[PDB]
Design a protein around this ligand. Structure first.
Ligand SMILES: CCCC[C@@H](CN[C@@H](CCCC)C(=O)N[C@@H](CCC(N)=O)C(=O)N[C@@H](CCCNC(N)=[NH2+])C(N)=O)NC(=O)[C@@H](NC(=O)[C@@H](NC(C)=O)[C@@H](C)O)[C@@H](C)CC
Length: 99
Protein backbone atom coordinates (compact mmCIF):
# COMPACT_ATOMS: atom_id res chain seq x y z
CA UNK A 1 0.00 0.00 0.00
CA UNK A 2 0.76 3.80 0.05
CA UNK A 3 0.48 5.22 3.56
CA UNK A 4 0.37 8.91 4.26
CA UNK A 5 1.57 10.37 7.55
CA UNK A 6 -1.25 12.54 8.89
CA UNK A 7 -1.89 9.81 11.42
CA UNK A 8 0.59 7.38 13.00
CA UNK A 9 1.36 4.54 10.52
CA UNK A 10 -0.10 1.79 12.67
CA UNK A 11 -0.71 -1.63 11.12
CA UNK A 12 -1.69 -5.15 12.28
CA UNK A 13 1.04 -7.75 12.43
CA UNK A 14 0.98 -11.55 13.21
CA UNK A 15 3.81 -12.85 15.42
CA UNK A 16 3.97 -16.19 17.29
CA UNK A 17 0.41 -16.89 16.15
CA UNK A 18 -0.93 -13.71 17.83
CA UNK A 19 -2.27 -10.49 16.25
CA UNK A 20 -0.69 -7.20 17.44
CA UNK A 21 -0.62 -3.52 16.40
CA UNK A 22 2.70 -1.85 15.51
CA UNK A 23 4.08 1.38 14.12
CA UNK A 24 6.03 1.41 10.83
CA UNK A 25 9.15 3.24 11.97
CA UNK A 26 11.78 4.42 9.52
CA UNK A 27 13.70 5.91 12.43
CA UNK A 28 14.18 2.52 14.09
CA UNK A 29 17.08 0.31 13.16
CA UNK A 30 15.34 -2.67 14.81
CA UNK A 31 11.88 -4.09 15.50
CA UNK A 32 10.84 -3.77 19.15
CA UNK A 33 7.69 -5.29 20.64
CA UNK A 34 6.20 -5.07 24.13
CA UNK A 35 6.91 -7.77 26.72
CA UNK A 36 5.58 -11.18 25.69
CA UNK A 37 6.73 -14.74 25.23
CA UNK A 38 8.22 -15.90 21.90
CA UNK A 39 9.47 -19.37 21.12
CA UNK A 40 13.14 -20.22 21.22
CA UNK A 41 16.34 -18.80 22.64
CA UNK A 42 16.99 -15.14 23.34
CA UNK A 43 19.93 -13.11 24.54
CA UNK A 44 20.11 -9.88 26.51
CA UNK A 45 20.68 -6.64 24.57
CA UNK A 46 20.45 -2.86 25.17
CA UNK A 47 18.95 -0.36 22.74
CA UNK A 48 18.64 3.43 22.71
CA UNK A 49 16.01 5.98 21.88
CA UNK A 50 15.26 9.65 22.47
CA UNK A 51 15.32 9.25 26.25
CA UNK A 52 18.13 6.81 26.90
CA UNK A 53 18.63 3.06 26.94
CA UNK A 54 16.50 0.08 27.83
CA UNK A 55 17.14 -3.63 28.21
CA UNK A 56 15.51 -6.02 25.77
CA UNK A 57 15.46 -9.74 24.81
CA UNK A 58 16.83 -10.43 21.33
CA UNK A 59 15.13 -13.23 19.40
CA UNK A 60 16.52 -14.14 16.01
CA UNK A 61 14.86 -15.49 12.90
CA UNK A 62 11.25 -14.85 13.96
CA UNK A 63 8.56 -14.94 11.32
CA UNK A 64 6.39 -11.76 11.31
CA UNK A 65 3.58 -10.97 8.90
CA UNK A 66 3.26 -7.21 8.44
CA UNK A 67 0.04 -6.00 6.74
CA UNK A 68 -0.01 -9.28 4.81
CA UNK A 69 3.72 -9.22 3.84
CA UNK A 70 6.08 -11.81 5.23
CA UNK A 71 9.35 -11.14 7.00
CA UNK A 72 11.69 -13.38 9.05
CA UNK A 73 14.23 -11.67 11.23
CA UNK A 74 15.27 -10.30 14.56
CA UNK A 75 12.63 -9.14 17.04
CA UNK A 76 13.57 -7.33 20.24
CA UNK A 77 11.13 -7.76 23.16
CA UNK A 78 11.03 -5.40 26.09
CA UNK A 79 9.44 -2.31 27.68
CA UNK A 80 9.03 -0.21 24.59
CA UNK A 81 6.38 2.52 24.80
CA UNK A 82 4.99 1.49 21.37
CA UNK A 83 5.42 -1.66 19.24
CA UNK A 84 7.62 -0.62 16.32
CA UNK A 85 8.57 -2.30 13.03
CA UNK A 86 12.07 -1.13 12.18
CA UNK A 87 14.30 -1.12 9.13
CA UNK A 88 15.47 -4.69 9.63
CA UNK A 89 11.98 -5.91 8.65
CA UNK A 90 10.84 -2.91 6.59
CA UNK A 91 13.57 -3.71 4.06
CA UNK A 92 12.29 -7.28 3.81
CA UNK A 93 8.82 -6.16 2.80
CA UNK A 94 10.21 -3.64 0.28
CA UNK A 95 9.18 -0.49 2.13
CA UNK A 96 10.48 2.85 0.90
CA UNK A 97 9.91 6.50 1.71
CA UNK A 98 8.75 8.60 -1.25
CA UNK A 99 8.25 12.35 -1.74
C1 LIG B 1 8.91 4.28 20.99
C2 LIG B 1 8.21 5.59 20.65
C3 LIG B 1 7.82 5.64 19.18
C4 LIG B 1 8.97 5.50 18.17
C5 LIG B 1 10.10 6.50 18.33
C6 LIG B 1 11.17 6.27 17.27
N1 LIG B 1 12.22 7.28 17.37
C7 LIG B 1 13.58 6.82 16.94
C8 LIG B 1 14.55 8.00 17.01
C9 LIG B 1 16.00 7.75 16.66
C10 LIG B 1 16.88 7.80 17.91
C11 LIG B 1 16.88 9.05 18.83
C12 LIG B 1 14.06 5.65 17.79
O1 LIG B 1 13.80 5.57 18.99
N2 LIG B 1 14.83 4.74 17.19
C13 LIG B 1 15.46 3.67 17.95
C14 LIG B 1 14.52 2.50 18.04
C15 LIG B 1 15.10 1.24 18.71
C16 LIG B 1 15.90 0.33 17.81
N3 LIG B 1 16.82 -0.44 18.37
O2 LIG B 1 15.66 0.32 16.62
C17 LIG B 1 16.78 3.27 17.29
O3 LIG B 1 16.93 3.23 16.05
N4 LIG B 1 17.77 3.00 18.13
C18 LIG B 1 19.07 2.69 17.68
C19 LIG B 1 19.99 3.84 17.97
C20 LIG B 1 19.82 5.01 17.02
C21 LIG B 1 19.98 6.27 17.81
N5 LIG B 1 20.86 7.31 17.32
C22 LIG B 1 22.14 7.16 16.93
N6 LIG B 1 22.73 5.97 16.84
N7 LIG B 1 22.85 8.22 16.59
C23 LIG B 1 19.60 1.45 18.33
N8 LIG B 1 20.03 0.50 17.49
O4 LIG B 1 19.44 1.29 19.54
N9 LIG B 1 9.64 7.89 18.35
C24 LIG B 1 9.95 8.69 19.34
O5 LIG B 1 10.83 8.42 20.16
C25 LIG B 1 9.22 10.03 19.39
N10 LIG B 1 8.06 9.89 20.22
C26 LIG B 1 6.82 10.10 19.79
O6 LIG B 1 6.57 10.35 18.63
C27 LIG B 1 5.67 9.94 20.81
N11 LIG B 1 6.06 9.43 22.11
C28 LIG B 1 5.69 8.23 22.57
C29 LIG B 1 6.10 7.91 23.97
O7 LIG B 1 5.10 7.47 21.82
C30 LIG B 1 4.98 11.30 20.96
C31 LIG B 1 3.70 11.18 21.81
O8 LIG B 1 5.91 12.23 21.51
C32 LIG B 1 10.16 11.16 19.84
C33 LIG B 1 11.29 11.38 18.85
C34 LIG B 1 9.43 12.48 20.09
C35 LIG B 1 8.66 13.13 18.96
Amino acid sequence: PQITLWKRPLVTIRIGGQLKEALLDTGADDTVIEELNLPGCWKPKLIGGIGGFIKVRQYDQIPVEIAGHKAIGTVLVGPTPVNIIGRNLLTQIGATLNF
